[PDB]
Design a protein around this ligand. Structure first.
Ligand SMILES: *[C@@H]1O[C@H](CO)[C@@H](O[C@@H]2O[C@H](CO)[C@@H](O[C@@H]3O[C@H](CO)[C@@H](O)[C@H](O)[C@@H]3O)[C@H](O)[C@H]2NC(C)=O)[C@H](O)[C@H]1NC(C)=O
Ligand SMILES: *[C@@H]1O[C@H](CO)[C@@H](O)[C@H](O)[C@H]1NC(C)=O
Ligand SMILES: *[C@@H]1O[C@H](CO)[C@@H](O)[C@H](O)[C@H]1NC(C)=O
Ligand SMILES: *[C@@H]1O[C@H](CO)[C@@H](O)[C@H](O)[C@H]1NC(C)=O
Ligand SMILES: *[C@@H]1O[C@H](CO)[C@@H](O)[C@H](O)[C@H]1NC(C)=O
Ligand SMILES: *[C@@H]1O[C@H](CO)[C@@H](O)[C@H](O)[C@H]1NC(C)=O
Ligand SMILES: *[C@@H]1O[C@H](CO)[C@@H](O)[C@H](O)[C@H]1NC(C)=O
Ligand SMILES: *[C@@H]1O[C@H](CO)[C@@H](O)[C@H](O)[C@H]1NC(C)=O
Ligand SMILES: [Ca+2]
Ligand SMILES: [Ca+2]
Ligand SMILES: [Ca+2]
Ligand SMILES: [Ca+2]
Ligand SMILES: [Ca+2]
Ligand SMILES: [Ca+2]
Ligand SMILES: [Ca+2]
Ligand SMILES: [Ca+2]
Ligand SMILES: [Ca+2]
Ligand SMILES: [Ca+2]
Ligand SMILES: [Ca+2]
Ligand SMILES: [Ca+2]
Ligand SMILES: [Ca+2]
Ligand SMILES: [Ca+2]
Ligand SMILES: [Ca+2]
Ligand SMILES: [Ca+2]
Lengths: 271, 271, 275, 276
């Protein structure tokens, strides 16, 4: 990063809202029960026409339905330029909802893990292991300096310490600085060693249900309410979508253009 | 575009080949008979590795099969950042190959036509009508200033002068200045009035078979040869792919990044 | 040691003059290479004598003109020996021979330096864009298997030749290119077909390839981007071999004016075998 | 690099060249031994190539830097002898009555010949001068020459009666035939099995050294009768055992290579004259 000098007297520039609405795309990820309750199917076209009033051209809005939160957690591709994630809260899904929110909101640099050969440590605070799949049950057996289990026997998977069971997505943090042996169902689930970089400006999460419960920061001490974790009450999905459409300017104002020299190619819905 | 002054003694910048290969995607479009002759199926991954040797990241190369030339001709969507189009020449497909090459190689600004109602002229030299679908059969009837057909009755479609039949794609040019009544088979084909902007520098077409026959310029007088219309003799598709991979530096150098502000969203494959 | 390091200073105003002499042969020699189709259609056998008699009036003394007769393009591609000084090669175009004609043209029109390749023992690479592998013989089936850095075949198992990848099958001549900098394990029928690691020096200009038939299809440069039109890549249009030979004889002064007797080699081979 | 031009080279005479030191040619070049098959038969072995390569390594030549190209016998090797190699040694075993065949083979592989083709059934030929010969190579060459006077009428021979021709060689796999320089000749030889080429002699070939293993000095390579030079590359050694001969060659290989030199035509310096 080179320095960029700037005066403190230059006049504020005009509003760039129209430029960004003409140049960018918005995409909404909502659960299937939304469409089920709406009981329609001209509704995507109607909402596109409705967005056109707020100033998003006809092709700018992309509605990507997903089955439900736990099933969408498994490797979410956010094919867009401004991402909204409607997220219906149900009791006992708190941790999984938080996991998904952390995953998409935060920028991660992930490396493959070969569970069958190497025992993996965690470098520090920012490192986690993310396991995604149809059913991930990661079991961890910590190891000594001589590679012998403590609280576990390295060859008896039954004595291992389970930290996730049958979960589509698990973000495990273990004690940093200790080698571990992992048992995860290699045919089903894929585990990656990831480091949390800064935040992802592209995505916003609209919790639809209950109290302020999302905790992106795995640290117990800090529980910061980030601006992109919006929340709203609901009884009717039509009311939720009308709320979003009416207040779309505020939402995209909260979000901001993504900035990262990525290396993994993937499909994007850009103009 | 505002003026851009420049000095004639600026030192040449360092090469950007590494940067562009690190921040772009190469985008191969090959016929299905290619893979059938290959008789393999790790070959996509193997070619990705052989591209990684040349410099591209592991996922930056995207392979897209297509059925055959006309079936690709209908709706060419180039879902990626540097497009190479392998194109096997066989006899009697000269004009459809040329039509496809022209359509992908030039930028078109274009909009629909409601054939059943209006009469349509053509603005000038750079204004064609592009018909795409399962089976296009344009049948045109020129009119007079009095709105009576010449060589054709305005009502009797049987007297209309057909200018293409049963083609998946047709880039039809008619006399520029005469109101034409069109019949086209609305079910299995759609016709859109299109105007030709500057070149689409993002694509490059590699004719695999025999001699130079592509004539993208519909004008008889001019038959220019463009750097992006490559031609390579062949007997084995493995040899074709190996030549392309080895000389990819030359190909991407010949090709340039796109420059056109689109008003439409689409699925690109970027990094 | 021809002192090929010091510059030669010319002058830009003096003069247009004559070339003195050179005493290694009484005069240059012209040298046709035609297919047997020509003889069969001509249906003669004093015709070489007649063609020599007609070159004599063009100004070529008797012993200077020689004729060579190859079976066809593929059978000439194997070890094309140019035993001679001004070589013309009449290549009758036929459909599906486009790549083979291009192979032969790229072979003879350019000056190759070839090393041996012991396929059974070692893997091989390609140093740069100018380095090809040239395989010749009665029948070549070059199956390659590229290996990663760890000497593990990618897309192929080095122990199973069936998984190897056939870049060219059953060819009399194959100028095969593979991705540069990657080791390859090669497999070809060593009894019948041999292979060589050949780098491309500059162009050879004894040879004029006269495509007798169709359109401009010769692509000597393996680069897909470039497709140059060399002056020696001639293309004439034909109905009858008498007309073809008569055109060559009539215009032979231009044919040799566009060539150079200098770039000639001791041995008649199409490459310099450097062991 | 200014190829294809004769441009003079000026050079100081009193230059120290204290940097100049011995060049280790063997670290890069490739030695290349040709021996008769009876050598192998007497040796009665089959890792002797390996043993000699190991001994060459101990002299200094890398493992892959020595080739052993067997040849059946002198006559069968004489036909189209192609020495595509970087330092050729040829162990010619001498037998009585093979004097001229050894001499002509040695001439062929010691002198660089520039060869034009010939069409015997179409043209008459005359040798330009001292440096020109006709090289006839094949399974069995039988050259019959009919000299022709100015009126194209044969002398000592009828132009049509091949039988009256004057045989200059018969049943020879190699024949460097020299005739009167300045006389047109009509040639006759068995075109299917033997080829003949009009060959000028350029300078010497320095890539090749010929160890005569047997008798006295008989190699008169110069077709002139007056001059009988002894080129240093025409080496000679007595013998009673092929193992002894091979050990001698391996022991003294450095001196042999000093006698030899890099092929002049092979270098880039000869790029546009007659490069090979
Ligand atoms: C982490 O722990 C699980 C729990 O055991 C491991 O599952 C085990 O996987 C192996 C290989 O897939 C199974 O081996 C099987 O053995 C039977 C006979 O014992 C044989 O018929 C099969 O062909 C196969 O070899 C093993 O049964 C299976 N264990 C259980 C309880 O089903 C898992 O492999 C561990 N993770 C890693 C990375 O090894
Ligand atoms: C910015 O806003 C002011 C006030 O509305 C307007 O006068 C000006 O033209 C705007 N800037 C541009 C570039 O249009
Ligand atoms: C500058 O160019 C040189 C080429 O010699 C290259 O090695 C170097 O990496 C380049 N530096 C940058 C920053 O691109
Ligand atoms: C074209 O003509 C056919 C036959 O008269 C008719 O069925 C079809 O509807 C016509 N299409 C249009 C667009 O007029
Ligand atoms: C050079 O060649 C031409 C060819 O016609 C000849 O007329 C001329 O006399 C020659 N030069 C000299 C100095 O004779
Ligand atoms: C080529 O492959 C065949 C099997 O198809 C094998 O028998 C042969 O030895 C291989 N050639 C070489 C030189 O290894
Ligand atoms: C050796 O030294 C001389 C002068 O001392 C110099 O001209 C020459 O270039 C040097 N050559 C080498 C190979 O060092
Ligand atoms: C050599 O002589 C024989 C004997 O008559 C003859 O048949 C043959 O044609 C002669 N060779 C040539 C090249 O004419
Ligand atoms: Ca335990
Ligand atoms: Ca979870
Ligand atoms: Ca941790
Ligand atoms: Ca927390
Ligand atoms: Ca078409
Ligand atoms: Ca009509
Ligand atoms: Ca027009
Ligand atoms: Ca044209
Ligand atoms: Ca394979
Ligand atoms: Ca071939
Ligand atoms: Ca190559
Ligand atoms: Ca080319
Ligand atoms: Ca003899
Ligand atoms: Ca006689
Ligand atoms: Ca003589
Ligand atoms: Ca003598």
């Amino acid at each position: 990063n080179i320095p960029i000098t700037g005066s403190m007297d230059t006049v504020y520039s005009n509003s760039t809202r129209e430029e960004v609405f003409l140049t960018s795309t918005l995409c909404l990820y909502y659960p299937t029960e939304a469409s089920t309750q709406i009981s329609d199917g001209e509704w995507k076209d109607s909402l596109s026409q409705m967005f056109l009033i707020k100033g998003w051209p006809t092709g700018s809005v992309y509605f990507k339905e997903y089955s439900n939160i736990v099933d969408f957690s498994v490797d979410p591709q956010l094919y867009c330029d401004y991402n909204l994630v409607l997220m219906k809260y149900d009791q006992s899904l708190e941790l999984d909802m938080s996991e998904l929110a952390d995953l998409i909101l935060n920028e991660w640099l992930c490396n493959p893990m070969d569970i069958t050969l190497y025992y993996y440590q965690q470098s520090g605070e920012s490192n986690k292991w993310i396991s995604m799949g149809s059913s991930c049950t990661v079991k961890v057996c910590p190891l000594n300096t001589q590679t012998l289990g403590i609280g576990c026997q390295t060859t008896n998977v039954d004595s291992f310490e389970t930290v996730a069971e049958n979960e589509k997505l698990a973000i495990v943090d273990v004690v940093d600085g200790i080698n571990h042996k992992i048992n995860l169902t290699t045919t089903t689930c894929t585990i990656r060693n990831c480091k949390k970089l800064g935040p992802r400006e592209n995505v916003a999460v609209i919790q639809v249900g209950g109290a302020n419960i999302l905790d992106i920061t795995a640290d117990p001490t800090t529980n910061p309410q980030i601006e992109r974790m919006m929340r709203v009450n609901w009884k009717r999905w039509w009311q939720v979508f009308y709320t979003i459409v009416d207040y779309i300017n505020q939402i995209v104002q909260v979000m901001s253009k993504r900035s990262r020299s990525l290396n993994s190619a993937a499909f994007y819905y850009r103009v």
